[PDB]
Amino acid sequence: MISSLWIAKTGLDAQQTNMDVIANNLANVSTNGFKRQRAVFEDLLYQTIRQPGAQSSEQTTLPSGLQIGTGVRPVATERLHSQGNLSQTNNSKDVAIKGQGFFQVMLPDGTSAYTRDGSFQVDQNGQLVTAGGFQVQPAITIPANALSITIGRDGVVSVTQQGQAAPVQVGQLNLTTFMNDTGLESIGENLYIETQSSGAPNESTPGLNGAGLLYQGYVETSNVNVAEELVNMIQVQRAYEINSKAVSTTDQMLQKLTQL
Amino acid sequence: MISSLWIAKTGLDAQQTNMDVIANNLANVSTNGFKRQRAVFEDLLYQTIRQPGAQSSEQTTLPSGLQIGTGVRPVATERLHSQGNLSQTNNSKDVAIKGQGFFQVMLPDGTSAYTRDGSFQVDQNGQLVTAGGFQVQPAITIPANALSITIGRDGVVSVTQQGQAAPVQVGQLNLTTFMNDTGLESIGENLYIETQSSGAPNESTPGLNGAGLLYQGYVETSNVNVAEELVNMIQVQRAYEINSKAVSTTDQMLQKLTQL
Amino acid sequence: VMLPDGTSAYTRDGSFQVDQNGQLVTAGGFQVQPAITIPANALSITIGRDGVVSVTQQGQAAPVQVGQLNLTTFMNDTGLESIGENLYIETQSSGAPNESTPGL
Amino acid sequence: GAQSSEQTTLPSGLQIGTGVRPVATERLHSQGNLSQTNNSKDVAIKGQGFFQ
Amino acid sequence: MISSLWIAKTGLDAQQTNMDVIANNLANVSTNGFKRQRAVFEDLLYQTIRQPGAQSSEQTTLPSGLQIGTGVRPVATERLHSQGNLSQTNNSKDVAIKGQGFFQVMLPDGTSAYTRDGSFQVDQNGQLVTAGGFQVQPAITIPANALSITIGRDGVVSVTQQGQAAPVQVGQLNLTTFMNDTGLESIGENLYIETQSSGAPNESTPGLNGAGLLYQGYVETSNVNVAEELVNMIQVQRAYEINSKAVSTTDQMLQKLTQL
């Protein structure tokens, strides 16, 4: 219709994507291990009408020619992989992560995903599974009689038996690091999958090779800064307000064009 | 309507559920043997617009693609099976448990239930019931002429007849251990039942196979930390604040859209 | 930044990332110039006020230097032709790009 | 650290910190007082020592 | 959106970080050896409109030009390394430090950590560690038949052997001092690691080379002045109220700009 209306459409859609990301951040407070998202925007085509070069006289230069430009296409959503805060669950089975790293998990299809969520359990077979029955990697089968479970800062998980007063180690629980964490493709369930932007997953014991440490009895909280979200949401409402006013102005102009 | 309003609605549901859990934990203080509940959350679908991989040109790769995401689906609620504080009740029919294990009970339907409440009773037949006529198992019959009942830390229950200078042994009170204490389903009445998440029940004498000990004259208090519950209450109230603010913001965005 | 074609554009947008190879790319995969490759297990990245980008390692108690974040100044900034993706391109009216370190 | 220039060093970098995790509730074994019960079967230890 | 809203956003973030610092100090009372934290703020760019010099006429000069300015960027958080109160813990295994100095520790990764905590403990191999098996430096082994362990104010550790009436010299406990105590990067666990701003560590016996003395049987308390933290918390609550008022005013300005 009119060049202005498509541009204002792009503005409305971009501000709506901002509100979408803000609402998804806002709702996932109290989601352990959740990572904030933030949209990155990007201007679209610029229709060149006079070239910024394009000599004007036999000597002059025509600086800064005409180009109009459209669109605010949202180009990406970065995910902030900073350390979230801890909290006392006082659950022997919940473990948070001190720094980089991920827990590897085996999906029913046999593929592997990665989660920063320490809300672990034990199923009827003694395997550590994570709130949805996903059997973690590497396998850890707790013996049926076990009284106490401990997980060191280096990850060696060891149980205490009845009578046998020696904390026999039962397994090793190691982390996986990516050289670009931001590029992982989240699939819900607090689970990310490997994509060819993240890089090959390198498995290591905690503490070594740059991976984080392990804190048993804690869970890492979502790193959502709520004040930033409220002020951002005020900003988004006012930006949508402005772009709607642009649409209305274009509409009224096109009115008195038709009435003509 | 808007992709933001559904997300905020899921956020309202999540905070409402978490407040439900907090309220149930809070109200069940002074309920013996009650185990604190804790809700574990998890985000739903991420609707992707640009894949995090998906090389654009022959050299570019487009790191950190654009996907929006929705929802805070409450994935589970764990139950903290830690030893509750004992208090000296001075009653001979209150037996508490020190360590893992559950008393078995016969429901009137014939199937078996399990409970950590020792505030026992003796019914008009003299059998050992629990506040609801639920016959503990295996059935223990207290003779009419008994003056006292003593329940040792080994679970060996005996009574003192009048005249006879001997505590005739009237039975053995054995516990039951499950591999996944958290996986037991709660049916109310402070009673749990068998489910395949829990695993097969292992019946055993108190003391052996990792089962607990019995403390007569003690009651096991609910492990509901009032401080953690109140701070959770504050946080949940504020999260509900913020999510309703998000709903309001999207509503105003929509209404100015409509006015045009 | 270096476009897929091979030529260079100029952006004022700092929303940087890193790709699967460690290169510093700009929200769409265009490699910044000069190339700066963050090492695999860098606990933290720091970018000083003059652009010296460095990282910390797993106990090496000093930030290993990783690269320089140069900028360019133009005689006429308003003359740059914008092409989208928040990228400008050098024209006849902008003059040559005077590469320099920040602060000088 | 975080060398902020060719030469500037930026001492005392900013970092926030969280939490007061209690590692333990340890058992203080110090010498206490003694009281007179006048019972031959009641014995008190003065100084280091534990009853087997 | 509006410059006012960006400036106020930075103000809210700054007050939030200040309150975070205050809350961390407040929570960490009664934590041995903890050092108070103080946030230093620093305004962001000043966007000039009329240059403060910039001769207007050929004789006048335009003093004090117009520049607007933004932001309150928190530049640093220094850690006050002042001596805390010593309290008589009466334990033969708690040693405080009177004056500058840190106990060096070998991490499982092997890199050198440092702690100002004297709650030393002994593992199953008899050596000296600090609450987690962190093998102190230099290597010290308490003999199995040792009865009382004294840590002299000079820094020599000696044990009272079985039978022999001699407190045999069994090891040396020597401190480390830095040029920049404030620069040490805390990594939790009451541990500081050397950083390129702390300066090279200088190892020396306690009492010499400027290092402090060792007080056996004492513990050093966190130097947290509770009343000072209270006044800081009142002040930051006021400042946050004010900045939220600024955001509200900017938002109302915008709202009736659009309603126009």
UniProtKB/Swiss-Prot annotation, chains A, B, E:
Pfam families: Flg_bb_rod, Flg_bbr_C, LlgE_F_G_D1. The keyword Translocase does not apply. Keywords: Bacterial flagellum. Disulfide bonds: none annotated. One of its GO terms (biological process) is bacterial-type flagellum-dependent swarming motility. It comes from the Bacteria. Belongs to the flagella basal body rod proteins family. PANTHER family: FLAGELLAR BASAL-BODY ROD PROTEIN FLGG, FLAGELLAR PROTEIN. This is Flagellar basal-body rod protein FlgG. It comes from Salmonella typhimurium (strain LT2 / SGSC1412 / ATCC 700720). The gene is flgG.
